[PDB]
Amino acid sequence: LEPFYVERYSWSQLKKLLADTRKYHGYMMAKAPHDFMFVKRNDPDGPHSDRIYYLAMSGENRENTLFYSEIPKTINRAAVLMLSWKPLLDLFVGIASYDYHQGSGTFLFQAGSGIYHVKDGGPQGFTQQPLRPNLVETSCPNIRMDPKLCPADPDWIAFIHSNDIWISNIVTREERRLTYVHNELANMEEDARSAGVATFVLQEEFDRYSGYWWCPKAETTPSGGKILRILYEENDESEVEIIHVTDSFRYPKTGTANPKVTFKMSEIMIDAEGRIIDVIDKELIQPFEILFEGVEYIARAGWTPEGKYAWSILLDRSQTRLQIVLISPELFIPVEDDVMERQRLIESVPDSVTPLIIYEETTDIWINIHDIFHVFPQSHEEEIEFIFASECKTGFRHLYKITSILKESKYKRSSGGLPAPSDFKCPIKEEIAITSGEWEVLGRHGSNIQVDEVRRLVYFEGTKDSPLEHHLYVVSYVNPGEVTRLTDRGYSHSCCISQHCDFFISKYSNQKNPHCVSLYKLSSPEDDPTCKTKEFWATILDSAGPLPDYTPPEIFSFESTTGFTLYGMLYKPHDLQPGKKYPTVLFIYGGPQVQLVNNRFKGVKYFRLNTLASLGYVVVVIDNRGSCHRGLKFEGAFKYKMGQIEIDDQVEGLQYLASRYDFIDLDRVGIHGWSYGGYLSLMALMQRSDIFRVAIAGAPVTLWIFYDTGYTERYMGHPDQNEQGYYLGSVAMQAEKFPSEPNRLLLLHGFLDENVHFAHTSILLSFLVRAGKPYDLQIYPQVPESGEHYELHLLHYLQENLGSRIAALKV
Amino acid sequence: LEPFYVERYSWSQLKKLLADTRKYHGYAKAPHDFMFVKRNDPDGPHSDRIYYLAMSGENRENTLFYSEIPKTINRAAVLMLSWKPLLDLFQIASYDYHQGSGTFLFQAGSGIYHVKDGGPQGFTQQPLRPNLVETSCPNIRMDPKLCPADPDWIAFIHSNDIWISNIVTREERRLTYVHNELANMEEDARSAGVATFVLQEEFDRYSGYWWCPKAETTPSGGKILRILYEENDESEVEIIHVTDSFRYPKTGTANPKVTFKMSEIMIDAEGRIIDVIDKELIQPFEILFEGVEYIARAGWTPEGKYAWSILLDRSQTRLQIVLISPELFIPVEDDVMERQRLIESVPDSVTPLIIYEETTDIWINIHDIFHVFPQSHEEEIEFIFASECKTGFRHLYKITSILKESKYKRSSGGLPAPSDFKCPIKEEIAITSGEWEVLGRHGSNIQVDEVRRLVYFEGTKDSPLEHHLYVVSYVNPGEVTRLTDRGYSHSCCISQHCDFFISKYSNQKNPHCVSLYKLSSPEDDPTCKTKEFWATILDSAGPLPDYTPPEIFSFESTTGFTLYGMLYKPHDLQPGKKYPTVLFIYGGPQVQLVNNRFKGVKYFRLNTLASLGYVVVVIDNRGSCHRGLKFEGAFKYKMGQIEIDDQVEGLQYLASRYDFIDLDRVGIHGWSYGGYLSLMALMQRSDIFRVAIAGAPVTLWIFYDTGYTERYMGHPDQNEQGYYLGSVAMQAEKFPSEPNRLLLLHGFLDENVHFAHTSILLSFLVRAGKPYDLQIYPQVPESGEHYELHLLHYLQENLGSRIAALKV
């Protein structure tokens, strides 16, 4: 077997080969249609059942904006209907999201500096032409964030300005600040209080972006006015670590203080004319730490559908205990300066009115927070019926229908004592498994459920058919049995369901076929409303079909000494020669919450894995233990042991490939990844120098004590209880183990990285220097220009130090 | 001509090699800051005790020693003075001394300490216990100084304000109220008695206040002590950040607002403070000294009648020496009416006195030479100054200026005109002259003998490659007598008594020695001076066994100047074979690399390189110093445009004389201005230079400071083209498209050449699609060893070795 040697291109020639083949800037294309909403036309004479509204980019260099398409009552089943995108807004930055109120037809969105509104599909009817956006007028000096329509009165919006909540009336022009917690004309180290804003760790590590929730119902007052309510989180970041990059912000490093959090409630009195009478800020009747002992993080919150109770999903610091809590507005009382007056209000609140833990669970691995939580209309004063998803019972996420009894508590506030841990716990009347099996329901990154309350069905997405494809399923929540798959095999799907439960949209792709979006009509046979069938209705987005210049990889699997099937992707060298062994590049992520190996189109983001194969590299990707869509036990393998197990699985997979394929030259293996991938690239060269000639680490984690609480503690615990795993997991603390031979270690980092600070790369550099070890470095100090330089530099480095003829001579 | 290829060592082999040969760390302080105190004991064996600072061997604290100078020596033998420690180990970078009381004052760590030796209370025979100056001040005290008028009183800086403290009464007292330590650097940018960044970094002025050397007595039998001090407002000055913040005037932006202030301290007969009166200039600094941007130097006349100052314009092409009577200052009074009364009480006759003014089309070079003779007429001041402005070489002038009443009378409510305060010049006499310079920077100064009417000075008169000590009469200047011996470069000081001198001297072959020399006169002519060796203070180890020195060479440039260089020949030079060449460069103003000194400490690794098979070259291009103003002035407005021509010229000269130089395998390497020229070399002359390794390069002249950049390049508005052509970062498209030719090295927290220079360059290299290599040293012995290791390996893999030739 002769070594294959990649063509040795000049710098200028690699630059040209890359620019000639370059297809997409920043590893993304036009954002496919998304955030769909179905509105019925309710027009017996007309040809259309529904209008769909959605966000999309019509082209590559376009803004994300609002479109609608018409859903015909009938189609020609001989042909394929392509829906035409009619713009909703009359435009001469982008819209990331929007709000809608069914009853009025009011849209509300942010677009750059402005909050705007328009009306369509309400009582005022359906436009045939683009609408002019109506700017909501403000006096606020700074940009307004996170606007939301009051579901009980669409003349009212809320929004954030300089970390306080304001409200504003789009009819009357009345604008009112509700919270006085932050001073814009002040320092960041002096003022670390914020209302209605999710803090860094909740945004980055729990994907909660909003910190305030309109109560969905008005309370009518005896005057003929009403009360609106906003539940909001209030945060004090004073004790939280501050870090600067070239300004600065509050980053809870692992084992340090998270913010100090609480629930507040703004109570807003409006008269018969829609003008504010008064605004009463309310606080909890006893402080947060008393009512919810042991709770670090407010993971999710909202209201029950009639607005009787607020709810929250609450996590302990170790993220191994989860509680769902009902929080009556009655637990809130005016913020009172007068201790005398204040004392009266506290006793004016009955002892019966205390928090209600309707659900609690624990695990020895970790809680994976998700967006599934559906509350049924209350049928009885002292019962709540809901659907929630959990891995805690079987180690795969499944749907459970639960009924919790709303008991009066043992604990009495009057007695002047403190509550016991189980004093607010609610008895569980009923806990039925809706789903079960060796596969998971999806509840993250847009995956959710739709509940049909008429037919007593729940639509959900899951791994049931294959851990490599997401599919849409329907099942009864009343007498769970048959789970019906609604999407077709040989694609991975990403769906949403009409609110009306009679249509679904799928965005779908596979290894060979770029992404498409199609609409499917849902029906039931006349005899059984419980049974669901689907028919193709129309295409929303066609793909351009297979790219002529992209060769997909093949999915492979292998049974592993660890007891699991591990999946991988193999990119065979183009124009493959017989009796020639070729240099190999392992591309890796390997960290929690991500899966690289599945049946999806890889030709956009991972196009350059194809470019590499095209130059003569074997490219390999493997999802090691710790990767997702394989259940909690598979995910849990590296708890406390991050960095210790991932390279075994990668090497196992590589030896699998090399015994099965003799074109793989194990003498010439490179590894490359970003972030956790950068981490595992370094660990690889450190631990398995015999396997890996070269490691290129992008934005690596090098010291877990420099990373945040929400992520690090979940997988590695508090550092005080895992000094040894933090040590063995931190590449920076083990610089001595890297090779004493140059051209083997390349570090790549942005200077202004907000997630994986440059601090990781500079502390590693500091320890590499102490240990007298060599390293190559590239810095991208700000754009498409940076990305081209990286790709150019990476190809040139692999050529010169792995693949080329000269590479072999250099040793 | 068959190419030599260096032995291709592994990383581990190179690390071992460096560590085996490593003789020094971070490139021990030789005795320095000497002082001579007379014994005045007719029966004792010694004339003088000398005090100095030194480290007693490496990895040791700089501290105070003394040695005994014997009245006589055995002229057959060589006397090695003993180092006697002056200080006991505790419960030093500089020191102050008060002759009359024998008081030493110095900072050591967070403490200010004092001891007594050599005054009335006599001479210790054992280490003395340092006495702490006790304080209530929370933060570190800086820049402590004895009041020459009263050695019980010290001043110091605390949180950018001036304080005084009595080492006997223990009274402590804050004099100035300009800074609040609690407030942030964006809000509070005022300081008193403290030299700001550009004056410390670009003009070597470290102190910003000066004790008046005389007390005025009061009616009561008390006294008034005075401190002249500069007050700075940095509010308008650019701020920069490093992993705190600091005030850095970027070229073309604002320098601090500056003024003089006077603190008037009333002391009663028992030595207690009665009162402190803060005083300000009768009219603003901008009115009294028009066009003055920088306070370069300040002090007092020897009797304390005037404060003096050397003032520069922003272009640094006008220098003025100004006398400032304490009567120009009035109490700070916010009471509008009372203030007016105070203004009226100051006579019109009291006025700034410009005793000297000079201009140049090149630049003013600030130096430390300024001697004021005692006044013998209220109408006149006699002094010795040094200047390049008359001939283009720095010479000593003896000047007498007439202190006349000014035409400007303050009461007439006008503003003064530019020449209103100019004093006439009664006399200007050249003391030295010729195609050579007097040294006045980095410790070089003069000692004036006012009995024999001689001045001692150092100079290049004998050669541009050696500094020598000289003496000449300042009355009938003629014969200049060299006192140091040829074949060494000397760095000297003279006893205040003008009867001894010390020299620290070395040459290419011989490491640094320090020796004491007795000065005397033939009985018939006291103006005639001879020297005799007296003793060794510091013996050298003799020639290093490891180290092979370079050879100094010169070539007659097409530019019309002789240019000097150093050549390290490859070790075990094989005939017929040609070796790869590393050019080491600085090439910037105020520095000379090529001279007759020992290069075996700092430039040792140039010898390691030669030991591996590299020809090493060093050349002093035009712009370098010790060759006069015209030579230095070559790159005025044109930094980066001439230096590499001189480098290549000397390289081509060496190559045509020596077949053993492989011109196809030349690398260049430098730090700072040398990193700058390393980048310029690769950019302008990729035909000559395979590899450029640039350490802490300047890449963008508008990111460097006012004091340096504007001196040599002017205001960026007056020099668009020089600033563009001189700024590497603006020309990233002119770099090679071939990788492994360009390596950048930078510290991340560099306070002098900011990392910003390297990051802006990388931004433009990336935008232009250009390759580069980078090493960062993120905060030391550790860093030094890694750099030497990476640099040897980089040159091996990309210039010198078999593999390097194959690679292209």
Ligand SMILES: *C(=O)C(CC)(CC)C(=O)Nc1cccc(C(=O)N2CCN(Cc3ccc(Br)cc3)CC2)c1
């Ligand atoms: C890590 O989590 C981080 C950085 C903190 C998150 C933003 C990260 O992922 N950073 C990142 C930087 C740059 C690019 C990418 C990235 O997504 N890709 C996609 C795949 N591409 C593979 C590739 C590309 C080119 C070649 Br020549 C070979 C292989 C890598 C960059 C992520």
Ligand SMILES: *C(=O)C(CC)(CC)C(=O)Nc1cccc(C(=O)N2CCN(Cc3ccc(Br)cc3)CC2)c1
């Ligand atoms: C520039 O003015 C600066 C950086 C702002 C001032 C501190 C600078 O000069 N920096 C600097 C950093 C590190 C070392 C040095 C230095 O003076 N030397 C000594 C000379 N030495 C020659 C050498 C050493 C080793 C080898 Br393998 C070859 C040549 C280089 C560094 C200055």
